[PDB]
Design a protein around this ligand. Structure first.
Ligand SMILES: C[C@@H]1CC[C@@]2(OC1)O[C@H]1C[C@H]3[C@@H]4CC=C5C[C@@H](OCCC(CO[C@@H]6O[C@H](CO)[C@@H](O[C@H]7O[C@H](CO)[C@@H](O)[C@H](O)[C@H]7O)[C@H](O)[C@H]6O)CO[C@@H]6O[C@H](CO)[C@@H](O[C@H]7O[C@H](CO)[C@@H](O)[C@H](O)[C@H]7O)[C@H](O)[C@H]6O)CC[C@]5(C)[C@H]4CC[C@]3(C)[C@H]1[C@@H]2C
Ligand SMILES: C[C@@H]1CC[C@@]2(OC1)O[C@H]1C[C@H]3[C@@H]4CC=C5C[C@@H](OCCC(CO[C@@H]6O[C@H](CO)[C@@H](O[C@H]7O[C@H](CO)[C@@H](O)[C@H](O)[C@H]7O)[C@H](O)[C@H]6O)CO[C@@H]6O[C@H](CO)[C@@H](O[C@H]7O[C@H](CO)[C@@H](O)[C@H](O)[C@H]7O)[C@H](O)[C@H]6O)CC[C@]5(C)[C@H]4CC[C@]3(C)[C@H]1[C@@H]2C
Ligand SMILES: *[C@@H]1O[C@H](CO)[C@@H](O[C@@H]2O[C@H](CO)[C@@H](O)[C@H](O)[C@H]2NC(C)=O)[C@H](O)[C@H]1NC(C)=O
Ligand SMILES: *[C@@H]1O[C@H](CO)[C@@H](O[C@@H]2O[C@H](CO)[C@@H](O)[C@H](O)[C@H]2NC(C)=O)[C@H](O)[C@H]1NC(C)=O
Ligand SMILES: *[C@@H]1O[C@H](CO)[C@@H](O[C@@H]2O[C@H](CO)[C@@H](O)[C@H](O)[C@H]2NC(C)=O)[C@H](O)[C@H]1NC(C)=O
Ligand SMILES: *[C@@H]1O[C@H](CO)[C@@H](O[C@@H]2O[C@H](CO)[C@@H](O)[C@H](O)[C@H]2NC(C)=O)[C@H](O)[C@H]1NC(C)=O
Ligand SMILES: [Cl-]
Ligand SMILES: [Cl-]
Lengths: 537, 537
């Protein structure tokens, strides 16, 4: 065993924590919640994990720290009852995170890389979502049946290229910071066309003007034809909101200033179907026709605080997958507690700095465009890249693919280790594998359980389920670290400096309050199931 | 044991089959799906149950038919493995049917009996649904905590008044048929105010006219003020759909004729947010303003075939709850197979005749008004009653309450009988009860499981889950009746005339195809769970 702290503990944690939601759902979160409540969300979601890392350090400073994975540590240091629960919940969390990463990759591919690589098209006027759900499901089944056979053939090639996917993440982060620094002096040019407070999708028209001049003649634009249903300048079928207000271009990225960070400081939540609006523009009040409603930027899902906590939270998970190399380390009780806490601190500072950066540079209306409908169907993050937006797009695609492949390689190892331990004979048949030690049947089971995550067909709907399972895993870790101190069992002696039982109780209570925040109904169900099993034994 | 077929078997089945969906969700189903596809739905949903009744008759013509409930028949005649599965699924079906009946009673009370007995009000312009969901949850918790303590005190009083709730059902049916017969000669008067194809909610304005004459002077009506935002007759802020089309009153119930049954013969499905339209009216095309969209009849939920099958199906369940008196009968192997099949035939003929009746008499636009927003917030069914619409309203309220009370008295008996049998020790603590034999802890468990059904807070969302659980119960009944014939076990000799194994296989396949129709995702989950338990043993 010859492994240091850096390439043994810190780098697997920092490859597992970073991922998809920093590139897809962060600018939306900032522009919806405000910089203040965004920092509140990041501060809350990083204190469940820090106290869980303290409890895992108390796991790590006891006994022998047995070799292989992170399962056997809990299984030998806390009894089988907590160990099976933590292993099963971490298994379910990894298998649904695979489905989340696949859906992220397909969202990036369909809306940004290849727009005409779409099978289903939005027939009719409304319902551009059901076609999108059917369009996500097909490519999800294709990529899942591809990337399970790739794992079924090429484990050694996946472990060989395990560093390139982390390299793509770090290059893509540094590009964001370089463009954000340069945006103080010379901003890029991404113009936003608006009409009063209402912003409108630039993808369907050519030029942002009410009337243009061609051939020494004032002719109505194509934008006149989309709102007035006639190319004549003296008609009265125009809705009075197009008539009483004017069309204005603003800079989408105005550069880093105090005024921009002042404007995007407070929360502007929206209901499903509302139109994204500024606050400081003249806008005369008039009613709008219904047939011009797809000529705007419409908020997709309902936004609140408890939605955004549940969407943000799996950006911070990935602690337990830094102890998979626990046998290979030289001093296992030293590299684990230092390494995981350093990784969590670095990633949390990255999120704080990125929230402040996106709030300071990019204007909030471009921030409130999920899918980037306000700027030319581009990434809102990618407009802040310095060399080109394609750096973030390509690095995000390969990072999501690498994370999905690493989840699909990791989870059957855990189910293999649970099945071979004979803790539960109901899973006994999943102890069968190849002659190399690689699993055979458990790959099929994770391929089928991750399929049900794919068929929900949205990033924003799979993410609260991941929040639920990882919060159950961390809560049982904190219960097992607190009860063993409070009940005074022998062979439980934590040789850690900063450990005390009130920190584990605060971790338990905070990760339970987050569980009731993120989605209260299934937490209310899981309370009933766990209370029923408590009434049995 | 002195019980005949009529008051022993036929009357409990006919009290359990009839219920809430004949009074709330039948006219909506006819007006959405057409008479043809409605008869197709009724014909499909009654052939799962008829073949299941043939299989239960093959249960009934074997052995001794042991005393007490319907659980012990399957448990002693088919082994414990199928018996525990059928008992547990029928338990879950009864406990969620309690929540469905409570939500039906609260819907009838809030929208028809007492409109100002509402805590939450629709604040803002849109989102009249979230206030309604919060308004259903509160009264659901109140009525559930009332009607569990009523069962906890008054079992003898509930069993005493068990016939009055059936009497209310039959009086309410005969009132419908009397008004439907009289509607040939003299129809009632329920006028429907429309504007082109679009119909509009009469509840917010007074008179259906564009301009009225008061004091020898043409003055714009209040209906002019709701569409034009000004009481002046020469303004131009009116949307062109109000300007180019005219306001017309039609009879809502035009009387039974060939032309009415001709018009409502084909399916008119609608998407969420569309406006209910006729087919044979002049209507000039023009765009409509957005601020007049609550002045119409808007379809609440998305409508298709697989939605309507899942909503309709628990109107036919209630077979197994006709064998609860199996010990009390004189000849148990005679009254059960004749009685249950006669009950199913009578209720199915009631549904066929009622579908043809509602299609023939009531006009389809009033049929397509879920909650009755087109006619004065009245029941669409109740406008067809002869003496008064209040007969149907009061009988429907007391029938839903009686059905909920009977479900809450029935389900803990079944969990008691499962727990005392020691088939599953994990439920062993639910064998404790009173000194009378009445259960104590299992009442709390059915009160908490039915609570999670209440918190979904819609009739149309709880009903597919009931469809799922009762289809799983009937499918395991057909599997257990087919495998025992095909595997040639002794002590399985059905002394029934019309029994053959292909009927049980057709029942299995049809109740499985209905399971994939009603909601495919949770059926796809249940397939995985059952296939995993199959791979264990
Ligand atoms: C130990 C051993 C290992 C293996 C095993 O056990 C043994 O492990 C267990 C673990 C099991 C799994 C545990 C949890 C599960 C999650 C569960 O999902 C619950 C709800 C969610 C799924 O929603 C469903 O999604 C499907 C597909 O869309 C819907 O079906 C629809 O499909 C079509 C569409 O074309 C159409 O017919 C209908 O739409 C419908 O049929 C279902 O209806 C739907 O319920 C999460 O979805 C929730 O949906 C809400 C929408 O109302 C959404 O609310 C918000 O929605 C939008 C946001 O997008 C906003 O407008 C608003 O803010 C809100 O309205 C919620 O956000 C969202 O949470 C499914 C089962 C599963 C996976 C368990 C499977 C078994 C399991 C693996 C076992 C094994 C055996
Ligand atoms: C043997 C022993 C006995 C006891 C026990 O085991 C041991 O028995 C088992 C059995 C277990 C139960 C098994 C099944 C269960 C059903 C499961 O529900 C699945 C989905 C449904 C619930 O939907 C959820 O509803 C809640 C509440 O609304 C939502 O939460 C929301 O709440 C607020 C609103 O204010 C807000 O925050 C968000 O909206 C959200 O948080 C959940 O999100 C939601 O998932 C059915 O709902 C489905 O929802 C679809 C909407 O997308 C709908 O699709 C259609 O929707 C409308 C129609 O209304 C149309 O526009 C379209 O046509 C479609 O979009 C679907 O129709 C609908 O199906 C919950 C668990 C439960 C009860 C199990 C509990 C445990 C259990 C009893 C065990 C015990 C231990
Ligand atoms: C939209 O912008 C135009 C500018 O082209 C505004 O027009 C006004 O025009 C008159 C004479 O042309 C000027 O005296 C006013 O100062 C202009 N008002 C401004 C610049 O606010 C028009 O009023 C604008 N519409 C709005 C703000 O609703
Ligand atoms: C954008 O402008 C409108 C007026 O042109 C602002 O006013 C609101 O408009 C809505 C229409 O849906 C009304 O319901 C509100 O009563 C109006 N509020 C007022 C007049 O205070 C609207 O607030 C602006 N949007 C912003 C500032 O985000
Ligand atoms: C709505 O109804 C009115 C009837 O009051 C229609 O008015 C037309 O009126 C002229 C002269 O008053 C008649 O010669 C026409 O025969 C009427 N047309 C009819 C009765 O169809 C008006 O056209 C109607 N609007 C529609 C159908 O869009
Ligand atoms: C009611 O009348 C309208 C016209 O006044 C009919 O025409 C359709 O209107 C919709 C508007 O949403 C258009 O998208 C369609 O293209 C129109 N169809 C045509 C002109 O054939 C509408 O069909 C009528 N509703 C019915 C018959 O149910
Ligand atoms: Cl983790
Ligand atoms: Cl039944």
């Amino acid at each position: 065993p010859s492994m240091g702290t850096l390439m043994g503990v810190y780098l697997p944690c920092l490859q597992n924590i970073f991922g998809v939601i920093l590139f897809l759902r962060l600018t939306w979160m900032v522009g919806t919640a405000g910089v203040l409540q965004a920092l509140l969300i990041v501060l809350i979601c990083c204190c469940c994990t820090l106290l869980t890392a303290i409890s895992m350090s108390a796991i790590a400073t006891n006994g022998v720290v047995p070799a292989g994975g992170s399962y056997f540590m809990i299984s030998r240091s806390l009894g089988p009852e907590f160990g099976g629960a933590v292993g099963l919940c971490f298994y379910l969390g990894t298998t649904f995170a695979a489905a989340m990463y696949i859906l992220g990759a397909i969202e990036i591919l369909l809306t940004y890389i290849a727009p005409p690589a779409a099978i289903f098209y939005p027939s009719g006027a409304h319902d551009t979502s059901n076609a999108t759900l059917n369009n996500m499901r097909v490519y999800g089944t294709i990529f899942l049946t591809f990337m399970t056979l790739v794992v079924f053939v090429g484990v050694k090639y996946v472990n060989k290229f395990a560093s390139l996917f982390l390299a793509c993440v770090i290059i893509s982060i540094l590009s964001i910071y370089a463009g954000g620094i340069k945006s103080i002096f010379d901003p890029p040019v991404f113009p936003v066309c608006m009409l009063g407070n209402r912003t409108l999708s630039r993808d369907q028209f050519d030029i942002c003007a009410k009337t243009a001049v061609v051939d020494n003649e004032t002719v109505a634009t194509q934008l006149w034809s989309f709102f007035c249903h006639s190319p004549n300048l003296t008609t009265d079928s125009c809705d009075p909101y197009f008539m009483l207000n004017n069309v204005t271009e603003i800079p989408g990225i105005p550069g880093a200033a105090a005024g921009v960070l002042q404007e995007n400081l407070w929360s502007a939540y929206l209901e499903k179907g509302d139109i994204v609006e500024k606050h400081g523009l003249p806008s005369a009040d008039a009613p709008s026709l219904k047939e011009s409603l797809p000529l705007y930027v419409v908020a997709d899902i309902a936004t609140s605080f408890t939605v955004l906590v549940g969407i943000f939270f799996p950006s911070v998970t990935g602690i337990m997958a830094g102890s998979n190399r626990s046998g290979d380390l030289r001093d296992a009780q030293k590299s684990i507690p230092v390494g995981t806490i350093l990784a969590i601190i670095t990633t949390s500072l990255v999120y704080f700095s990125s929230v402040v950066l996106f709030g300071a540079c990019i204007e909030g209306v471009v921030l409130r465009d999920k899918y980037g409908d306000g700027v030319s169907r581009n990434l809102v993050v990618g407009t802040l890249a310095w060399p080109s937006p394609w750096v973030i797009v390509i690095g995000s695609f390969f990072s999501t693919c690498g994370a999905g492949l690493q989840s699909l390689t990791g989870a059957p190892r855990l189910l293999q280790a649970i099945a071979k331990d004979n803790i539960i004979p109901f899973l006994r048949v999943f102890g069968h594998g190849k002659v190399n030690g690689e699993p055979t049947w458990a790959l099929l089971l994770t391929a089928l359980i991750a399929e049900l995550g794919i068929l929900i067909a949205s990033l924003d709907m799979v993410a609260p389920i991941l929040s639920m399972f990882f919060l159950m895993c961390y809560l049982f870790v904190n219960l097992a670290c607190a009860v063993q101190t409070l009940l005074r069992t022998p062979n439980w002696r934590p040789r850690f400096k900063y450990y005390h039982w009130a920190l584990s109780f605060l971790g338990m209570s905070l990760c339970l309050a987050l569980m009731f925040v993120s989605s209260w109904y299934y937490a209310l169900v899981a309370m009933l199931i766990a209370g029923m099993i408590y009434k049995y034994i």
